[model samples]
Target: GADSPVLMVYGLDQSKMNCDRVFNVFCLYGNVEKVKFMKSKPGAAMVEMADGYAVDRAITHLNNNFMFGQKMNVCVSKQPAIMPGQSYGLEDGSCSYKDFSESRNNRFSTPEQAAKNRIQHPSNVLHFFNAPLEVTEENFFEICDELGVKRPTSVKVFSGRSSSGLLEWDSKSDALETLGFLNHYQMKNPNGPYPYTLKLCFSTAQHAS
Candidate 1:
């Protein structure tokens, strides 16, 4: 299993997770490379270990460590990952008995910021751009009011020029759920915009700051 390739384990973003927090959690199994929270879904994340061996260790040990009270599932991975409640290798390895698996491989393996889930790169905080361009910060905030998600420490938008700006979501988790629903999402009410496009993801600039 050393060469089988490492499997990625993620805690459903159900909310976003700080790479530090996630690393602390999964690193218990082995050395990690990158931690990615998928733009397609919040609480969704992908962690690649140093090698297949580390991945094996994760599967063997952290396969189902309970987090926030839920049993986390672990397994070997290849391409894009699934939402949850599914696995390439069952939680107890019971699914391995089957000949073939319908599960998908890790998609965020590209390591770059491509349109699709490429390999893991620095997490980015993407702002909404493609909107009609008439939308205001207040309007976008109203639609994506993080108030319910949690009180953001504070929010600072860039200016009146772009319908975009950076956000330090309260915590990775808070950003996850709200952004999960807003990504590539179209807003009919913003009537202010037609084809709504929100590139919801974190950026590395924040890591150093």
Candidate 2:
């Protein structure tokens, strides 16, 4: 258990839940440090515990816990130490999955944003990549419909338009993070006969090119 007791969430990809929703959900475990929903589409966030040992304790039980149907991704957030030369004022404000996976690598938009250096957003954005070829906007949205992803932006496939598409998270980062990390990544549809792979990331106006 780190003395910070703060747990930051990352890699929310494209689901549609924001910080407030995530805060409301994570607050049940302990005192929340912060929930950043300051981005477009799917978002990510961070949660801090009252005690250093609280996270490990919570994970032991809640790591695999399922609430509102989505699984919670309880990993130690990677935002604690800032680089010697880096400062918040000079940066993008906050940190999260955006520090890792930005959504400019799409096989569709493949435009000005290239495929490299595209880390996730600074906030919550649930991205479901490598989805099965049997997924539909209706079925996919319905599965995670309870999490609440508003203004769904767009749903596109990598190379095909049959089963795979991106689901954007707005205010429910926990819900998004939960589903993104749930390990039980299944499309849950009789329409599909296989499992799907999930890839979470932040989205930008300039998609992949």
Candidate 3:
């Protein structure tokens, strides 16, 4: 592995991949400093870290990962630092630093912060109950597809007396919309006679990352 904490990544959509999306994906490994999508090279981008160790961790975990409908190409970059005007930034008036440890977005900045943020704050997690017994990931995705919503990032179905599960989204706002649209949704079983209605609510359960 390269010693530099800079990583060049490819196999992303040239038009859709932005700094925030890149930060969200790589931040799981370590603190992210900067991300610049290479306009000249289309689908290629560079990410900077606080240290070389973080870079190594990211490479080991995400080098071969698939995301955004494309296989990622993560490798150590030859360049030392990101050049000015070579990458994009967030339109919401901030850099694309993941973990946001030092920023206001940091949820675990304090214990109270984590607790309040996880439960009271806007969250991309919802608990779905009153679903059909035959509900599966495929069928759930099909329901979302019909709603013109993107498939959830992660899903966990509960196996109990009734049908229930959790779903996560990239942002809390999207989750709110999904909840509003899905609540009281009527589900029809084409093959079986067991049809059911849905109930959606913000979940206190810890959600998928």
Candidate 4:
């Protein structure tokens, strides 16, 4: 049986949330194709994912999670697909709808890329990737402070690549909230033309070592 690859999301903070933020949160689970906020319904959105499995993963992990102080309601949508319709602007001045089908941030675009993802359930430990080569534990602390999320209790930068590592928080709820806010965060790259986009996902590791 095939499930619809679309999701209906409710209980968003309309004033603070936007399509790009939504993409940042959901893209961790799947390749988000589109995000559309309904003009008629504030705080509600339609998300089209690459596959039903992605929808399932998103719903499984994100449903009932709190974001921006609101409990999210994520479920399969009755609509088979989302239409752009007439676009509008959110309170943040970002467009109400965005097409991410061709976005470089999509991690599951290729089979190899998909295999690289750990795909663990939400946990207090987070696996971070694509960070700047010079990233340090203090850099993570500063970024977390900048984002207004609780800093990880521990940070371990993997020795060789210096780009991927583990971060452990005190609680799973804090980790979940931080993931919603910090995933896909961009960091300055002193030696590169483009900023490094930090990617985060739940990790099975109990703690950073």
Candidate 4 whole-model C-alpha lDDT, 0 to 1: 0.86
Candidate 3 runs further than 4 Å off: 86-149, 153-209
- Model 3 C-alpha lDDT per residue in residues 176-207, reported as the tens digit of each score: 44554455567875656765756555676678
Error of 2 at 104 (Å): 24
Worst 10 residues of 2 by lDDT: 97-106
TM-score of 2: 0.33
Best by TM-score: 4
Report the candidate with higher lDDT, 1 versus 2.
Answer: 1
**What would the TM-scores of all predictions be?**
0.40, 0.33, 0.49, 0.90
Q: Rank the candidates by TM-score, best first.
A: 4, 3, 1, 2
What is the C-alpha local distance difference test score of each model?
0.45, 0.43, 0.64, 0.86
How many clashing residue pairs appear in each of the predictions shown? 26, 47, 0, 0
lDDT leaderboard ranking: 4, 3, 1, 2
Candidate 1, 49-151: lDDT as tens digits: 6567557656775555444444556666664323333333323333212211221212223335223421122132333344444654455567666324432
lDDT of 4 by residue, 1-209 (tens): 22898999999878657787788778878899999998898899999999899999889888898765688899999989988889987776788889999898898999899787666677889999889988999998999999877999999988763399999988777787777778888898898678888988889999997
Alpha carbon lDDT at 67, candidate 3: 50
Tens digit of lDDT per residue, candidate 2, span 1-209? Answer: 66456565544333434443444334334444444433442334455554555455445534544434555566665555222232122132333222211222222222343243243332334345556566556655565555443434345555552344444444443333444333134545345655553434444433222
Supply candidate 1's per-residue lDDT for 162.
31
**Whole-model lDDT, candidate 2?**
0.43
Error of 4 at 103 (Å): 0.6
**Who wins the lDDT comparison?**
4
